[PDB]
Amino acid sequence: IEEGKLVIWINGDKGYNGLAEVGKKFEKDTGIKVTVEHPDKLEEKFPQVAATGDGPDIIFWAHDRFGGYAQSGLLAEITPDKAFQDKLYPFTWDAVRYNGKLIAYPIAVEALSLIYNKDLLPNPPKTWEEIPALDKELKAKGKSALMFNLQEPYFTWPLIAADGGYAFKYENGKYDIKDVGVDNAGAKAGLTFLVDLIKNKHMNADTDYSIAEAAFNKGETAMTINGPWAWSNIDTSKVNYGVTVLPTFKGQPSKPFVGVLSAGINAASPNKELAKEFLENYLLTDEGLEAVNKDKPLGAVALKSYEEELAKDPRIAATMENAQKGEIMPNIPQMSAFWYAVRTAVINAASGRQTVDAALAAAQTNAAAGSENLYFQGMATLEKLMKAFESLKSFQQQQQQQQQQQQQ
Ligand SMILES: OC[C@H]1O[C@H](O[C@H]2[C@H](O)[C@@H](O)[C@@H](O)O[C@@H]2CO)[C@H](O)[C@@H](O)[C@@H]1O
């Protein structure tokens, strides 16, 4: 990878130009090309391209995926003096800490909130169960109650989790890597509620990120579930919008997974020296954040000096309310598998393709398995077994036939 550039990948829903403004200031001072890019599904791409001349120097993602990448030795260790570490809240350092080493620089705390249209809904609903009633209402008025991305379990998870669904059990400060609360009763109850919305045409399993965004912005649905990055496009559509706590289900709080947006450094990179300089000296400063937060919000930020300001903004105050009630994502390498399972479990359940009981039954077993790396060789084994057992039945039958034809 050409030394004396910085190539940065960051997800497209994020303030990608805000950050590219920061790579200008850097270029001004250092005279270094900073190239911000946003390829679709970077979380999946990075590991394929890492150790190559087309790897990124820096990669932005929530902390969850980084332990994955860390295990595979794709991230360089970051070694910043404690004076610096004191600039940002510790718990953010905690998120990017794997086998006691730091692997990314924390940037932003992200939690989904309930974004609602203050016109169509003067009062937004305090509970999930209120919502079918509020669709009857707005179905009539040509509108819809609620629309959020079903195609990512990030958004579906707060509901599942709400009656004590969990990914991997935390006990003795470690994650019990074979104990998984996807197919537990409250998780089952969570998903069953959501399928019942789809069953009763109160929501539509088609719904992708784009559509949900269109609908709320174009004033067609009273509610979405999203994070602060979404906020900038809704300002634009001048939709009078509030940003509140997600509603209780079975009178328990919605428990979103809380990502920490984090900037890891490609262990392949020659510019690890520069990468650190950029992130510490330019991005993680009240200037370089304000540069992004203006483009598309970071929501709540790792950097304390700035977050002190942003906290007053009662949207970011509501974002932290949701987080407080939710849970920080594990950063274990198993999360990749867990995510895949639940994506599919929720798809299948909402498409009808599988019962709720059946979908989570699988996600359980598949998440506990640890890796999506075995699906091919597994499915091949499974056929091999199926085809054998069929052969066995076939033989039972030729034998029983052959015995009837000797009794004659
Ligand atoms: O949907 C599963 C998905 O959840 C998380 O991804 C979030 C994350 O908080 C942000 O990076 C933001 O861009 O939106 C994403 C949701 O689509 C996990 O970080 C990710 O691994 C997982 O695939």
> Main beta sheet, described?
8 strands, mixed
Roughly what fraction of the amino acids lie in strands? 15-25%
Gross CATH architecture of the largest domain: 3-Layer(aba) Sandwich
Oligomer: monomer
Percent helix: 40-55%
Rg: 24 Å
- CATH H-tier superfamily of the largest domain: Periplasmic binding protein-like II
**Tally of structural domains:** 3
Instruction: Could you tell me the CATH topology label of the largest domain.
Output: D-Maltodextrin-Binding Protein, domain 2
**Helix vs. strand class:** alpha+beta
What is the straight-line distance between the termini?
Answer: 81 Å
CATH class of the largest domain: Alpha Beta
Organism: Serratia sp. (strain FS14)
Protein name: Maltose-binding periplasmic protein,PigG
Question: Can you describe this structure in just a few lines?
Answer:
This is Maltose-binding periplasmic protein,PigG. The protein is an alpha+beta fold and 408 residues long.
